[PDB]
Amino acid sequence: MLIKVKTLTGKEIEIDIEPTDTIDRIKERVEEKEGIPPVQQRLIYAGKQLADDKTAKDYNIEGGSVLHLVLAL
Ligand SMILES: [Zn+2]
Ligand SMILES: [Zn+2]
Structure with missing residues (x-):
């Protein structure tokens, strides 16, 4: 799912x-495409840091879901 x-x-x-x-x-797939190290990524979804x-399944993330990235390290 994209x-x-x-x-x-x-x-x-x-x-x-x-x-x-x-x-x-x-975060690793994010690193493979964009080069941003996983250790520096904070991903937010449903108004909270993941x-x-x-798992994506644990957060009920679905196709077309939008996550927000904040840099953190
Ligand atoms: Zn897919
Ligand atoms: Zn937004």
């Missing part, structure tokens, strides 16, 4: 993920 990750500079990154990916795996060890 999701959008919006940054503070207004960039909108399309990332195709698996519903079974952990949020840390999502935990690395939970």
Whole structure:
């Protein structure tokens, strides 16, 4: 399922993920496309920061969902 990750500079990154990916795996797919290290990414969805060890499925993320990226390190 394809999701959008919006940054503070207004960039909108399309990332195709698996519903079974952990949020840390999502950060890694973000790193493969854009080069931003996973350790510096805070991803927000449903008004809260997502935990690395939970799955997209755990947050009920769906096709077309928009996550927000804040840089943090
Ligand atoms: Zn997909
Ligand atoms: Zn927004």
